[PDB]
Amino acid sequence: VPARILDGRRIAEDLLDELKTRVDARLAAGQPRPGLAVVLVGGDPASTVYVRNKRRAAEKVGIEAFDYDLPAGTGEAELLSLIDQLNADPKIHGILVQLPLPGIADASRLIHRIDPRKDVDGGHLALREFGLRPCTPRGIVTLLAHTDQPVRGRNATIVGVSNHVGRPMALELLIAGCTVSCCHKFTPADVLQTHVRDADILVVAVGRPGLIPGDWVKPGAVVIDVGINRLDDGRLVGDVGFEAAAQRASWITPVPGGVGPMTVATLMQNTIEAADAALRR
Numbered sequence: 001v002p003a004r005i006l007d008g009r010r011i012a013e014d015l016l017d018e019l020k021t022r023v024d025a026r027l028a029a030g031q032p033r034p035g036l037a038v039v040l041v042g043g044d045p046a047s048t049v050y051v052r053n054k055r056r057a058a059e060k061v062g063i064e065a066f067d068y069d070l071p072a073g074t075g076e077a078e079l080l081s082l083i084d085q086l087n088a089d090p091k092i093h094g095i096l097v098q099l100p101l102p103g104i105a106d107a108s109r110l111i112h113r114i115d116p117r118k119d120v121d122g123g124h125l126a127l128r129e130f131g132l133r134p135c136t137p138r139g140i141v142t143l144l145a146h147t148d149q150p151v152r153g154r155n156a157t158i159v160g161v162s163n164h165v166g167r168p169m170a171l172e173l174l175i176a177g178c179t180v181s182c183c184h185k186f187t188p189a190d191v192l193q194t195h196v197r198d199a200d201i202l203v204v205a206v207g208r209p210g211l212i213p214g215d216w217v218k219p220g221a222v223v224i225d226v227g228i229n230r231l232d233d234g235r236l237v238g239d240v241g242f243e244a245a246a247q248r249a250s251w252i253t254p255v256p257g258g259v260g261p262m263t264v265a266t267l268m269q270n271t272i273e274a275a276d277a278a279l280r281r
Contacts, residue, residue: 001246006224006253008262010146011131015265016060022272023062034063034275035091036120036268039082042072042102050259051098057264063271066092072102079110087115093278094120094271117278120270124207125165126226129260130253132205137168140203140224141176147251149200149222152177157199159183159192159239161206169203185211204239214244223252 027033036058040051051069058065068082079101086095095118101107111119131139144151156178160166166182173180181195185206196202196216202223204212209229217223217240227239236256246252 001243001252003223003246003249003252004147006143006147006222006251008129008131008260011142012261012265014142015131015262015269016057019061019265019268019272026272026275027062031279032091032275034093034271035066035089036063036094036096036271037066037068037086037089037092039068039070039079039095039097041070041074041079041098044100044102046258047098047100053259053261053264054096054098054267057261057268058271061268061272063094063268064091076104076110079104080113083110083113087113087118092118093275094118094267096121096267118274120267120274122270124228125205126228126253126256127165127205128266129256129262130224130226131262132165132169132224132226134165134168137172139172140169141172143224144176144201144222147222149220149250151201153179154200155179155181155198156201156203157181157183157195159185159187159196159202159204159206159212161185161208165205166203173201202240206239208239209237210241211239212241212245214241214246214248217245217248219248220250221248223249225253226256228256 038051038054040047055065086092095114097110099107127133130143156173158166158170170180170182183192183195193216196212197218199218200221202221204225207227207229223240223245225238225240229237238256242255
């Protein structure tokens with residue numbers, strides 16, 4: 001695609017650096033290093049990769065990763081037993097169990113057994129993967145700073161299903177000097193089209209496939225499409241027609257799919273928050 005890929009990688013790296021600073025400040029203050037148990041059952045290739053990315057993120061931050069790789073065919077009973085052991089171990093601050101578990105379609109009883117104070121994992125929109133949860137309102141500017149595209153003086157359009165997720169992004173773009181328009185899922189299609197066609201910065205957070213045909217995208221635009229729509233046939237698409245969009249945009253977010261680095265980095269952040277919460281009573 002002539003458009004470059006605007007993905008979670010650099011915002012993740014930045015967050016891991018910040019998290020390593022926090023773990024160092026904890027160790028400077030005599031506190032334990034946070035421990036993360038990551039459980040993998042079986043040898044599914046994608047899962048093995050996901051778990052390796054988690055453990056590697058953990059080591060990069062200085063969290064001690066305690067690895068449990070268990071054979072396929074391990075039953076619910078043995079997993080509950082393991083979980084109970086991790087629950088009881090004071091050096092373990094967070095517990096992640098990698099899904100899916102071979103032969104255990106419903107993982108609910110296992111997930112619920114994880115002590116809530118160690119439940120560090122705990123979605124029609126890929127907000128977490130792009131640092132665009134409402135609780136991180138500076139996210140959209142951080143993401144755009146990892147393009148080579150100007151912000152100030154440019155036209156931004158935000159297409160949102162809730163006023164609530166769009167509002168902090170609209171706001172940060174206003175403060176960054178953008179001329180901003182907010183369109184709702186109910187905005188008439190012709191009006192929507194007009195505002196997409198004018199947008200150098202396009203943020204789409206609706207969760208409806210096909211909402212924005214790719215050819216509407218302004219040449220040179222930054223397209224940030226966080227919808228995650230599961231189609232009829234299993235496939236994942238965003239709210240924007242990716243192939244058509246990617247011939248016009250200067251930067252575009254990737255087709256959703258898999259577990260990106262920013263999600264993993266946020267799991268490390270949750271681990272350190274859990275370890276920090278445990279120093280109370």
